[model samples]
Target: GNPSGWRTDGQWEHETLRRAVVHGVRLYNSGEFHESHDCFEDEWYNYGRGNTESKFLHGMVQVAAGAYKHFDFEDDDGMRSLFRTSLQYFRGVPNDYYGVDLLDVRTTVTNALSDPSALHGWQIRLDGEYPTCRPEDIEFAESLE
Candidate 1:
């Protein structure tokens, strides 16, 4: 699952890629799951395609899609499955990649999957409670630029 054989291109210096990351994170935190997925996917296609970073971005997109399914369609099983797949992608990356706290996100999703109570509440409230990037992670992302 590692990207050892993939082509690695693009740096954080790419303005479009950086902006995409910021916007995607904003959309994700705002609970705009569909929009977040779109944003991240665009970045992945444009800048990350054949690299480990692309895998990270793909995982994030999946997380957004998973959240949408959980909240919009009330697909608990789908959400859990997506979360697992997301983690698998992340597992191929380092703990801290592109300033994002991959470890924390992993732990958060892991906790949520283990705790059934996380899915029973209202969608908005439950989503808000879901594991996501922390303030420090955002700060780190900002510092990258």
Candidate 2:
């Protein structure tokens, strides 16, 4: 049974939820890891209680938390756990969730998980350039508003 009518399959979608998603994406892309988690945490509570959407948000929170630990505290093991947990959440989400390129993000996360060493120098990369959300995808989400 289709719910929000936003998708052919049954799923909930609301403008508030969409805004939260975009805001979180922007924060994550900006490397505001903990802030991204905070934004997503609010969405998780607003969107669902123990539902897939909520679970997905929870995963994202952990992901951001993990990244924060890695970059801020240099907790390699904790970061690995956080990324792995986040990957699990992403695995359960729709590939094109909320107009974002979740598949691309997941693939990037997978690569990062495979080689944490590669991520170590993103600090340096940031000086020149660093990975972030796909601009086209962000534009797609923005077009909805």
Q: What is the C-alpha lDDT of each candidate?
A: 0.62, 0.62
Candidate RMSDs in order = 8.7, 8.0
> For residues 1-145, could you state the per-residue lDDT of candidate 2 as single tens digits?
2222155544436666665566666667667666666666666766555566766677767766877887778887888888787887776676655655665556656777777665543321111233355565344434432
Please list the residue runs of candidate 2 whose C-alpha ends up more than 4 Å from where it truly belongs after superposition.
1-12, 117-145
Measured by lDDT, the strongest candidate is: 1
- Count clashes in each candidate, considering only residues at least 3 apart in sequence or on different chains: 0, 0
Off by over 4 Å in 1: 1-14, 47-50, 116-145
**lDDT (Cα, 0-100) at 128 in candidate 2:** 24
Query: What tens-digit string does per-residue lDDT give for candidate 1 at 1-145?
Result: 2212222553454556555555666656666677767777667766445467677777887877877887778787888898898888887776655445566667776766776345343122111243344565344444432
